[PDB]
């Protein structure tokens, strides 16, 4: 059992990675939602990744879409991929829809979900979670720009509100992944997204006993 | 192969499937690999490092003092001093080790385990622990003798100041337990502290596996 | 004795690249190692940045790479105990604690003379104490060694990087079995970091 | 970084090169429409075309078709390409849709796009984006009738008013790609379609500042 | 391969895949492709092709002078005539050239430049400048002397009419600086201009690279 | 000295093929350079299309195909100073500029004679002077040079063309550097365009 | 300051006895050891 403890499977397996809502009822009349891609989006993952200090990997996303009622009709969808340094869409029908460079999957809800593998983006030779700097005040302490892998704008291809709300589950599979660095896994609840921060009352890492001589918790 | 059925299984999502998809950005060439040193490939290598166990997590202790197993000059003798069970992905001491921390990613596991103990006392502090180990099916040993008939090391701070103990197998699908027993009296010459304190580490060994990946309980 | 780092020489870049007036010793002022003492880190290079000949080069290039060397005396009698870990960590962190969730400059570089831990169990950065025998390390046992060499080399995922804005590694000395001694010994433990940068190479000169 | 940086790469990627609307409600009860094929539809393509004197491509057009609301219902969509210098379309059942030398797409909007790759059109050895000449007034000027590559008609199949408009998005990829003698990047504004005419007011092609001995803007 | 299963992935449009579809006109056949000269296959081609920089581009110079470093006989000696940023990407002189334009559409660059200088007083107006690059770390110098003891070439007018400056490495995720100096008080004979121009020139080298697709800003 | 545009030599196509009587030199009209000179252009084959031999097999052969060699001598003392850019392009449209969006047949089609550009800046056609370099060009400095040599092949879509409706090319001289000088100096310095057409080709004799 | 310049470090407990050579001086103002 030596494939199953290795790095490239204990990073492998699509998982929910955002569950993105395109809302178009009630006050919400948007019909489009840009979801900036995190691979640390969940507290279960963002530990793992953060066991080592640099990784470079190609990720694969795949995205469940449905209505509020699991339906899936015949509606029509764009999945616009924004690349790092890109505008983004500032509304339903702005002209960065019509963007080559920006690619764009065009997928129905009765099509299986769409798949496309976003290549390694980071300016530098690997993903760094850990930035001991500045780019150039306290905030910016730890908050490495080359991280960023772009941003995912979803939206119904209609022209005027449709009146239903399209809930997008995004899973991601993190691809030939080569890890450096190997750190001790986090302790500490996080409490913030971009920072280590932790919380005063320290938690011990091993559960407590009456005695160090008594087997009994 | 123009004529083609459509099997069950088709437009299904399987998110442990290990398929192709198309580039998104065909012709974009990633930022080339230099070599960074510290590659690793394994869990397993980091299983196999040894990191410290936090046997004295007892209720009341707090941060460093945590990590450390106090060693006092005994009244009585023959006395137990710490016990551990060897069990890395049960809640317990192994919870402070890189090995029992991957042991809580994966459901069942497998192999030998070593324990080092270190002796932090002044160079001139002699005397002698027993480090005893049980095995699963006996339950924890009475007296320093009975725990002398069984698998043991006799340890001996003026010569040797780190000894390591290899747990010969354990499994999950109850456990080992490791006693350290006042073999001597804790002994100083004058002007010397008269108690001191053992660094327990533990880890892996090469025939160590991991099975089922799970995810983590923290 | 000597631990490499990751088992690999620091080496060359196949540029400023100073022969004896970089490479030589730098040794840091001492730090009283006391019985309440929680331990002391150091940024690299953020340490040597306004230190000498290696202080003048960081600060007047644009860009920087070293790999270094790290010699930690301490100087105890036999009759003087405990055990300090001193641990390498490649891109150190701090993390603030809040009931400020930001660190301050003064605690993310602390320079040369260093800055000490207030949460030695989590190492100031949420991750436990136990398991930084990951990172590179070597034990400093009053009654077996009073000495730790580790050689650390450049760790980065560019080929070069700022000196001033960027540290690689932090250096930290953490007594996990705490200083303890009887009336009469010296009340403190002097610990002496020595630093030797090695293969160091720099540009943007003005 | 050489083949991102390539003629070829340059003007790949699939890009919209009309939205063509087939209207059969309200007032406009067509239920047909003809689009002239337009590499320079919009001014962000026709900039980058520009760039070159002469191309010789391949063209691959994907219809990306769908109601209003982003509904795809079962209809049937008639995708019609008539070549340079042949009669097109005058009404939704005219004996033109019958052609058989105008090769038909039949396609239903719950069917993925229909995509069909036109050759090199021109009667030239390639487009010429810029013509100094006239083609035997002052209008014909800068005309090359050589740059004609057809009409896309679309038609919904039905004998009467559907009553629900059909958008259709033409996506197009510039497929062997050859360019030739290239030309400064347009910098005033484009005002007509088909001629290199520009405001009086002239936009610097450089943004302005203080001084010129001042880095400032 | 008659039985399949539809992955995901299936009925989509990604506007970047590259496939095949059935040509409209099959057994059509295209004007045979003569020889044309002037055939370009890379952008990196045309961006080391030498364009002027447009460095008076100051509020209220229209037209060609915007092209223009003027050069004038000066009362006090060792002023700055002229600075411009190497940015190839930003607002400023590089827009008016191609290496300019041409990385607008790319969201990262990096590789060197040079900047030609060519001098376009009288044959009889001799003089020197001191053209001085600073790396993107350091800021603007401030005097003629601070400036020598960087990156500079002294210019002699007399002698030689253009000179070229290489940029060493610049590239995009705070940028080098250029600076022209009056070395020496313009000269001329009697009934000779005693103001000129400067025509800069930039360009890429061998070693320039652009990287990520993007839609430019105008 | 000669420049080659796109590195090519004209030749013949693998017909009419006049030897010295087309070959010869043409001297066109010499422009006066002043102060407050915004530029010249030429459209080719147009400015020969009414002179000499070559006039008369442009107006008496349907099709046509050659290359053409580009002489600008420029006569200015060593106390004139200015810079002119010579720049051959191909498919040169000329462009209107409107508040007239379609530029009159007297500036498409200038003859021997020749049109001053309006708006030197965009080239009459909306493109930057700055990027003109792209084209096959040589700079005129008073104080470096005074004539420039463009040897420029038949760029074309089509083997033939007819010379009087289509214009393979034009050739602009625009001052980019103005002219300048001091009093008792000519006010104006003469710029004088020779052409050489070279491998001419007719067809369609009437 | 003075340990930027030519120096020794000393450590009592290891080396007893330690030799520092002085590079040169002449009379015809003078070194400094601290």
Same mark, same amino acid.
């Given at each position: 059992?030596?494939?199953?403890?290795?790095?490239?499977?204990?990073?492998?397996?699509?998982?929910?990675?955002?569950?993105?809502?395109?809302?178009?009822?009630?006050?919400?009349?948007?019909?489009?939602?840009?979801?900036?891609?995190?691979?640390?989006?969940?507290?279960?993952?963002?530990?793992?990744?953060?066991?080592?200090?640099?990784?470079?990997?190609?990720?694969?996303?795949?995205?469940?879409?449905?209505?509020?009622?699991?339906?899936?009709?015949?509606?029509?969808?764009?999945?616009?991929?924004?690349?790092?340094?890109?505008?983004?869409?500032?509304?339903?029908?702005?002209?960065?829809?019509?963007?080559?460079?920006?690619?764009?999957?065009?997928?129905?809800?009765?099509?299986?979900?769409?798949?496309?593998?976003?290549?390694?983006?980071?300016?530098?030779?690997?993903?760094?979670?850990?930035?001991?700097?500045?780019?150039?005040?306290?905030?910016?302490?730890?908050?490495?720009?080359?991280?960023?892998?772009?941003?995912?704008?979803?939206?119904?291809?209609?022209?005027?509100?449709?009146?239903?709300?399209?809930?997008?589950?995004?899973?991601?599979?993190?691809?030939?992944?080569?890890?450096?660095?190997?750190?001790?896994?986090?302790?500490?609840?996080?409490?913030?997204?971009?920072?280590?921060?932790?919380?005063?009352?320290?938690?011990?890492?091993?559960?407590?006993?009456?005695?160090?001589?008594?087997?009994?918790? | 192969?123009?004529?083609?059925?459509?099997?069950?299984?088709?437009?299904?999502?399987?998110?442990?499937?290990?398929?192709?998809?198309?580039?998104?950005?065909?012709?974009?060439?990633?930022?080339?690999?230099?070599?960074?040193?510290?590659?690793?490939?394994?869990?397993?290598?980091?299983?196999?490092?040894?990191?410290?166990?936090?046997?004295?997590?007892?209720?009341?202790?707090?941060?460093?003092?945590?990590?450390?197993?106090?060693?006092?000059?005994?009244?009585?003798?023959?006395?137990?001093?710490?016990?551990?069970?060897?069990?890395?992905?049960?809640?317990?001491?192994?919870?402070?080790?890189?090995?029992?921390?991957?042991?809580?990613?994966?459901?069942?596991?497998?192999?030998?385990?070593?324990?080092?103990?270190?002796?932090?006392?002044?160079?001139?502090?002699?005397?002698?622990?027993?480090?005893?180990?049980?095995?699963?099916?006996?339950?924890?040993?009475?007296?320093?003798?009975?725990?002398?008939?069984?698998?043991?090391?006799?340890?001996?701070?003026?010569?040797?100041?780190?000894?390591?103990?290899?747990?010969?197998?354990?499994?999950?699908?109850?456990?080992?337990?490791?006693?350290?027993?006042?073999?001597?009296?804790?002994?100083?010459?004058?002007?010397?502290?008269?108690?001191?304190?053992?660094?327990?580490?533990?880890?892996?060994?090469?025939?160590?596996?991991?099975?089922?990946?799970?995810?983590?309980?923290? | 004795?000597?631990?490499?780092?990751?088992?690999?020489?620091?080496?060359?870049?196949?540029?400023?690249?100073?022969?004896?007036?970089?490479?030589?010793?730098?040794?840091?002022?001492?730090?009283?190692?006391?019985?309440?003492?929680?331990?002391?880190?150091?940024?690299?290079?953020?340490?040597?940045?306004?230190?000498?000949?290696?202080?003048?080069?960081?600060?007047?290039?644009?860009?920087?790479?070293?790999?270094?060397?790290?010699?930690?005396?301490?100087?105890?009698?036999?009759?003087?105990?405990?055990?300090? /870990?001193?641990?390498?960590?490649?891109?150190?962190? @701090?993390?603030?604690? =809040? +009931?400020?969730? &930001?660190?301050?400059? %003064?605690? *993310?570089?602390?320079?040369?003379?260093?800055?000490?831990?207030?949460?030695?169990?989590?190492?100031?950065?949420?991750?436990?104490?136990?398991?930084?025998?990951?990172?590179?390390?070597?034990?400093?046992?009053?009654?077996?060694?009073?000495?730790?060499?580790?050689?650390?080399?450049?760790?980065?995922?560019?080929?070069?990087?700022?000196? /001033?804005?960027?540290?690689?590694?932090?250096?930290? @000395?953490?007594?996990? =079995? +705490?200083?303890? &001694?009887?009336?009469? %010994?010296? *009340?403190?433990?002097?610990?002496?970091?020595?630093?030797?940068?090695?293969?160091?190479?720099?540009?943007?000169?003005?």
């Amino acid at each position: 059992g030596v494939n199953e403890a290795s790095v490239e499977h204990f990073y492998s397996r699509a998982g929910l990675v955002g569950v993105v809502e395109v809302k178009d009822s009630g006050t919400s009349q948007d019909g489009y939602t840009v979801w900036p891609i995190d691979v640390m989006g969940f507290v279960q993952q963002r530990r793992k990744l953060e066991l080592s200090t640099y990784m470079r990997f190609d990720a694969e996303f795949t995205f469940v879409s449905n209505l509020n009622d699991s339906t899936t009709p015949g509606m029509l969808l764009q999945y616009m991929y924004v690349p790092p340094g890109a505008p983004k869409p500032d509304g339903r029908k702005s002209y960065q829809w019509q963007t080559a460079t920006n690619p764009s999957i065009f997928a129905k809800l009765s099509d299986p979900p769409p798949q496309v593998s976003v290549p390694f983006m980071s300016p530098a030779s690997a993903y760094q979670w850990f930035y001991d700097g500045y780019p150039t005040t306290n905030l910016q302490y730890g908050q490495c720009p080359n991280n960023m892998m772009g941003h995912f704008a979803i939206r119904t291809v209609s022209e005027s509100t449709t009146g239903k709300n399209v809930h997008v589950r995004v899973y991601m599979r993190i691809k030939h992944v080569r890890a450096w660095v190997p750190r001790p896994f986090r302790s500490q609840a996080y409490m913030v997204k971009n920072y280590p921060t932790y919380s005063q009352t320290i938690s011990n890492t091993a559960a407590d006993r009456a005695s160090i001589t008594t087997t009994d918790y | 192969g123009l004529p083609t059925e459509l099997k069950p299984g088709t437009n299904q999502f399987l998110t442990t499937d290990d398929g192709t998809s198309p580039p998104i950005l065909p012709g974009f060439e990633p930022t080339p690999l230099i070599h960074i040193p510290g590659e690793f490939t394994s869990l397993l290598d980091l299983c196999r490092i040894e990191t410290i166990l936090e046997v004295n997590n007892t209720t009341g202790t707090t941060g460093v003092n945590r990590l450390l197993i106090p060693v006092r000059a005994q009244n009585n003798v023959d006395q137990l001093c710490a016990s551990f069970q060897v069990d890395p992905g049960r809640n317990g001491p192994w919870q402070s080790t890189m090995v029992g921390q991957i042991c809580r990613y994966y459901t069942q596991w497998s192999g030998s385990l070593k324990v080092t103990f270190m002796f932090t006392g002044s160079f001139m502090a002699t005397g002698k622990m027993l480090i005893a180990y049980t095995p699963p099916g006996s339950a924890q040993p009475t007296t320093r003798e009975a725990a002398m008939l069984g698998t043991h090391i006799v340890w001996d701070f003026g010569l040797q100041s780190s000894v390591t103990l290899v747990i010969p197998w354990i499994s999950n699908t109850a456990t080992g337990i490791v006693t350290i027993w006042y073999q001597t009296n804790f002994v100083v010459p004058p002007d010397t502290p008269s108690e001191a304190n053992i660094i327990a580490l533990g880890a892996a060994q090469e025939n160590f596996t991991l099975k089922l990946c799970k995810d983590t309980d923290e | 004795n000597i631990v490499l780092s990751y088992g690999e020489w620091p080496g060359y870049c196949p540029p400023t690249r100073p022969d004896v007036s970089v490479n030589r010793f730098y040794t840091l002022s001492t730090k009283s190692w006391k019985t309440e003492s929680t331990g002391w880190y150091w940024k690299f290079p953020d340490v040597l940045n306004d230190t000498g000949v290696f202080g003048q080069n960081a600060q007047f290039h644009y860009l920087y790479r070293s790999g270094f060397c790290m010699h930690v005396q301490c100087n105890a009698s036999k009759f003087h105990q405990g055990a300090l /870990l001193v641990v390498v960590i490649p891109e150190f962190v @701090v993390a603030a604690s =809040s +009931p400020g969730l &930001y660190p301050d400059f %003064a605690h *993310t570089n602390p320079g040369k003379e260093g800055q000490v831990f207030r949460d030695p169990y989590v190492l100031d950065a949420g991750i436990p104490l136990s398991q930084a025998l990951v990172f590179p390390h070597q034990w400093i046992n009053l009654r077996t060694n009073n000495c730790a060499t580790i050689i650390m080399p450049y760790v980065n995922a560019l080929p070069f990087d700022s000196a /001033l804005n960027h540290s690689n590694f932090g250096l930290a @000395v953490i007594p996990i =079995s +705490p200083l303890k &001694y009887c009336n009469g %010994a010296t *009340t403190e433990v002097p610990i002496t970091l020595t630093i030797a940068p090695l293969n160091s190479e720099f540009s943007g000169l003005r």
